[PDB]
Amino acid sequence: STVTVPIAVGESDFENLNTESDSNASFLRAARAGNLDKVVEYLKGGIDINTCNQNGLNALHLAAKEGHVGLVQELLGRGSSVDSATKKGNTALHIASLAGQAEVVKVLVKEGANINAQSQNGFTPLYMAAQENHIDVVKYLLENGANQSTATEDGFTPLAVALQQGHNQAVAILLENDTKRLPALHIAARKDDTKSAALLLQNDHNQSKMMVNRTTESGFTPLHIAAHYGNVNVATLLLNRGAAVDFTARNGITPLHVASKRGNTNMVKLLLDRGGQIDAKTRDGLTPLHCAARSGHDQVVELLKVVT
């Protein structure tokens, strides 16, 4: 009876262990320490730039973990492939983001690292920077195209992990992105973020003054938004958690009005199934049927006529 976002755990740090072929190990230790001169010397000496440990970390991965900007530049300069993945499927960009190494993030991004790459647990750089509350990396990633909506295979998002981890600022930046002002649940409805919705809703159990039925200025609920954008999943969740199916906004507008006006067929279906009133009327006499007609959404009309 729990909603629980998965946590990116990072790479190991065996190279930090003081010793108390072996050329390779020593080379990786030099990378971990950020000793450019030593690393360059080994490379000149012929050691392979792609040398990695049992977990698949090369020197680029180690320099990035540790914020060694200069060294990251040198390795990149020498042909280190920006997006080599470790065995967990992490790129240097994942690692730097989890670790909050902002200058390193910049350097990798400018080198064309894939800003939306997913690890084999489905995590993105943004998910990592978000999980760990690395604000500046978050902002930087957003400003550079990173997509908040790229999700673990179970729909886990940066917003969801920021929420679970209690990170107010992260949550703010994530909610406030690409808008130039709705409540969070509403925004989660827009985005169709069931997990984040679930998280937000975890403390009202039992209709009117429930959080699931809070309104915006114009009296819309998360359910109205869901209906507007045609987000069936998040709508289903809200309705399961007690959203009033026939809740009227300004002008007696119901979620069914909204979905009918936007020709959102499956929303209409869902709302009907949950008992939404087929014939409710706006302050000016419109029915869901009329709203759809005035909008050429025939798909709906048909469906809507059948029911009657």
Numbering used by the authors: 1113 to 1132, 2029 to 2188, 2192 to 2217, 2221 to 2322
Quote the study that presented this structure, word for word:
Surprisingly, we found that the C-terminal part of the ABD (ABD-C, the 27-residue motif identified previously for ANK repeats binding) binds to ANK repeats with an affinity ∼15-fold weaker than the entire ABD, indicating that the ABD-C is not sufficient for binding to ANK repeats. We further showed that the ABD-C fragment binds to repeats 1–6 (R1–6) of ANK repeats, as ABD-C binds to R1–6 and the entire 24 ANK repeats with essentially the same affinities. Based on the structure of the ANK repeats/AS complex, we predicted that the Nav1.2_ABD-C may also bind to site 1 of AnkG_repeats with a pattern similar to the AS peptide. In the complex structure, the extended Nav1.2_ABD-C peptide interacts with the surface of the inner groove formed by the first five ANK repeats. In particular, the hydrophobic residues of Nav1.2_ABD-C and AS occupy very similar positions on the hydrophobic groove formed by residues from ANK repeats R4 and R5, and subtle conformational differences in the finger loops of R4 and R5 can accommodate amino acid sequence differences between the two targets. Unique to Nav1.2, the binding of ABD-C extends all the way to R1 via charge–charge and hydrogen-bond interactions. We noted that Glu1112, which is completely conserved in both Na+ and K+ channels and mutation of which in Nav1.5 to Lys is known to cause Brugada syndrome in humans, occupies the identical position as Glu1622 of AS does in the ANK repeats/AS complex. In contrast to the common expectation of directly interacting with positively charged residue(s), Glu1112 of Nav1.2 is buried deeply in the groove and forms hydrogen bonds with the sidechains of Thr94 and Asn98 in the R2 and R3 finger loop.
